[PDB]
């Protein structure tokens, strides 16, 4: 599909699509780039994440609108169209999970790449869990938790407490606990420990690293304000 296009041209077109706010295009360019089989640089991993974040973010917001309407109603149309949007969302999550399993994660040896991809695996199972019902929901939740836990274990061993990758993983795992796993205390404990550990490490940073880390710390704080 993007098999005939040069890797470098796919990356170039992904950045153009980002400028144009054409996130479905950007995601398809980045899927093509991944399927070239080469590992992704830091910049390229960020392009991949931004593209699919935006695509699934749209689908999630739409699914929430439709599910709200369907709940209020409780003919077949609202259910039918919520299911169409749900299926397309699951498809996008399955596509991203597929890229990570074939073969991004297994080739990723450095902590910055491995933690990034395992956080992504956690996040896309987490979006699957948001629309899942029943027992099915359990196995998906456990997949998300496992991915996030492996990423946390590597990040705590390999990265400083202020590393933005590590801080963003902890932010999302804390949201997983509060919103998916019905564990608001675990969510608050994680976000509070993560914030306090980063605070203590800020003195080590340059002005630009300080701004990157404090930005994500503020997100942990905003959640802690919401949750306490």
């Amino acid at each position: 599909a993007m098999g005939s296009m040069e890797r470098a041209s796919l990356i170039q077109k992904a950045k153009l699509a980002e400028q144009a706010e054409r996130y479905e295009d950007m995601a398809a360019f980045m899927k093509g780039a991944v399927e070239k089989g080469e590992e992704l640089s830091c910049e390229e991993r960020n392009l991949l994440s931004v593209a699919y974040k935006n695509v699934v973010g749209g689908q999630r917001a739409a699914w929430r609108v439709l599910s709200s309407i369907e709940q209020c109603s409780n003919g077949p149309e609202v259910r039918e169209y919520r299911e169409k949007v749900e299926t397309e969302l699951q498809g996008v999550c399955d596509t991203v999970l597929g890229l990570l399993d074939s073969h991004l994660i297994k080739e990723a040896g450095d902590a910055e790449s491995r933690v990034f991809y395992l956080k992504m695996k956690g996040d896309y199972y987490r979006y699957l869990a948001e629309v899942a019902t029943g027992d099915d929901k359990k196995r998906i939740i456990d997949s998300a938790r496992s991915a996030y836990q492996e990423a946390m274990d590597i990040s705590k061993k390999e990265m400083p407490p202020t590393n933005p990758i590590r801080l963003g993983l902890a932010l999302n795992f804390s949201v997983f606990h509060y919103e998916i796993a019905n564990s608001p205390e675990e969510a608050i404990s994680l976000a509070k420990t993560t914030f306090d550990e980063a605070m203590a490490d800020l003195h080590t940073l340059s002005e630009d690293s300080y701004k990157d880390s404090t930005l994500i710390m503020q997100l942990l704080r905003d959640n802690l304000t919401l949750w306490t």
């Binding site: 919103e179 997100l219 959640n223």
Partner: peptide, 4 residues
């Protein structure tokens, strides 16, 4: 409440 997640990143981004």
């Amino acid at each position: 409440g997640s990143l981004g």
